[PDB]
């Protein structure tokens, strides 16, 4: 005791009808808050701070529940208390939580499980403590600084006003750069010097300075870095790649130039990122992993990257002038993990909402990128605006127009307003756009002439309008704002249609992404339309792992699409995620530096020597074997790596593990294992490579996926032939293979769930339990189902982005085979026939576990031999010994 009776109140941000938030704590029992969407929680505000010693909790029916529940002193910090993860059900008696005597004047309840519905309920919750007789402090507005203001935009002028200031700038970060990548005590092995462009071209030298130092010049900061780069690569065998495996043993003595070098590069642009990348890989990255990142870029003569950061604190500031509070904003935005969609105009506010500290956070990140940015002379590409506003806009704004857009995935898309409206009426598009625009002026300053934006993207409707018309004037509004503003757009099955594009009224000042130039090439009516286009390799899916690439067409189609057209700009990467088949990236940016095609086989050997630190004829003959296999030239339409079996929902006649995968194998597998034998083989040697073992586990993971595929199929046919004993033998070794399959994922620091969850739940200071619950949730959700039922199910979403991953196959993929095995094999010896599995909600049942209470898992990889792990496959669970095996 005592009972808190007096003075309390609640409120929630979503209910069923008739069923609100305040029937939690209406002393009815009858009567119960429900939830209407994924904001599955509510606030109960004690009034005045209580010393707790105890919670009771009671749910509508004896259903087992799950919750969380956190307590906040302060108003700001909700810390957690205490939970539910038992599964005993609910009944008439409640459920009373001890609480070790905590401060407390507002407490949240986050219900993450019903296991009789998808909606959960609370009929009633007492709080019990001792009045402290304090209150909760006011909480401190959400407050961010303009750039003018700041010493950013002191720097951001004084660079741009004074040439001697900004090329000593640009020279000591190339500098810096050489001491990240390779160690500060190479720094003074080079000299660099600025020069002019060659011919309009961008363009570096590599040459010996007399006493023994490299001299390189280049025309900016990304030339520069570029010449460090080919020296690195083509004098010293070194090969840097940060996410994805370097060799970065350096020679004993500084390799001599001899013949001095200048090459140039024939493109305006060389572009890097798809929004989705800033969600499958990018959203928990602290600064470090994004000065890595821009290191690597401008190594690899990246010049133009699109950027959302900080986006956000932009968006609340636009919103604000139009009738919405702070929390309005938040319940727009998305969580962390979906910034992709939320800018591309597909969903709002699941994952979130975002702690009040996120705005300033994230709009310092952004500074903090733009500074480099300039000194390297590279371009972001920031926000356009087409009329994007929330759905409830014309509520708090009774004359402005707007054309619903529909669902995408099962969410709701937000509204769009009317791009042009009749006389008569008011024009909120140019009202929101001028805002829009200026608040990204105030938040970041004028950092760039590229804006992206992309209405109407995988949907949306167009409503009455003249789709020609809508692209005219988002343009004219664009240029209105920047004189010499560039509209870069994606194009992507056929958005924007012909109809669309011609709508461009100055096509100088749009430039088209042709998104998945090296599968899908959709060019030609760009080119026909004298619109400038970037020719880019897509290449990853959702963060989908397997060995993908097309490194032929990279070598070739390149170079041809420069000889036939005019208006080519450009090449770049638009990846889902940049997580696999490094030979894949290295090779395209390689092809800005050449108008020639290039052979891709002795480019391939070339690569693995200086990736490897060395090589030998047997490692050689491995990588052909990949080429020829795995990396051979295809010519059908397909979307990132074959799925493996074992990420796919358990069932029959499985073609894919997602909605729009692929699992079918178009190479030979027992000539693909030789790749792994000759690895193997060769592994005591090559160990001391951590490239090689990068690549070692690659191509043992695809053997075992290949192999599980063929186990499958026998598995399937023992059970459709009434064959219990030939599936309980061959479903046992299905099972077998997935568990040495995690022995292979559980060495490499990339492939550990353990380094996902944990940089979400540390990505900003000082966050509360809340927060990094939250953004756990996110992180669990964004590799599994997704969304929610409606998205990962109805929606399609499910295991778009699954991982092979440690952790996560021994806890997710592994538990939902063995799960379906069990059901097959209980029917077969006689059971009762196998029940329909509810995938979703074993799924969402993992989603939700927190890492404080549940499991925690490692950061660390493992030291499992992979050319002992490879021996056991090739005996074990392979193709080639499959009759042998089963
Ligand atoms: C969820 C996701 O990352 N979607 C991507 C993806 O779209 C999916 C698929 O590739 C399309 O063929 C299908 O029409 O829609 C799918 C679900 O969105 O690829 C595109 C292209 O990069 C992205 O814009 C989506 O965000
Ligand atoms: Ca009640």
Redesign the pocket.
Known sequence: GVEITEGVTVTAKGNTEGNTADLAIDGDLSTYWESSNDYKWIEVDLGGIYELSKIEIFNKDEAVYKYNIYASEDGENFNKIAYKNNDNVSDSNGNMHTIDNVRAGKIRIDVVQNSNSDRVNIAEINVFGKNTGESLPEVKKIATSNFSETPWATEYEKFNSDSAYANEKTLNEIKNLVGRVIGREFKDKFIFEIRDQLNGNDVFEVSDSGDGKVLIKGNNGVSLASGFNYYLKNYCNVSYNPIMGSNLKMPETMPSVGERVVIDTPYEHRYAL???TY??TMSFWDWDQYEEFLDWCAMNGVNLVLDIIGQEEVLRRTLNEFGYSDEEVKEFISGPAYF??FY?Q?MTGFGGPLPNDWFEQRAELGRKMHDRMQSFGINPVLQGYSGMVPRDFKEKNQEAQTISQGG??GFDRPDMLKTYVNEGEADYFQKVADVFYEKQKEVFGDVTNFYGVDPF??GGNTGDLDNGKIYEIIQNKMIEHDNDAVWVI?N??GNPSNNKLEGLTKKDQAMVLD??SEVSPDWNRLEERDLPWIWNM?HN??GRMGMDAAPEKLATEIPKALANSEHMVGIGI?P?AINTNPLAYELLFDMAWTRDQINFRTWTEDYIERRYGKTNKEILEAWNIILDTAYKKRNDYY?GAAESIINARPGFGIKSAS??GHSKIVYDKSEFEKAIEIFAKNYDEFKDSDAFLYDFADILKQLLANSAQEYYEVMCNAYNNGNGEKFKFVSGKFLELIKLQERVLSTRPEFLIGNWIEDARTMLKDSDDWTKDLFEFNARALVTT?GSRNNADGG??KD??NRQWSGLTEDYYYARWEKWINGLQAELDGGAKAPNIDWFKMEYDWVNKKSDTDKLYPTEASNENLGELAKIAMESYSVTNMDKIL
């Open positions: 798809n929004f989705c969600s499958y992709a969609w591309m597909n995408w995935c993207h995988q994606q992507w099955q998104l998945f897509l899916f959702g638009t889902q979307q909605t729009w997704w399609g979403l778009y982005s």
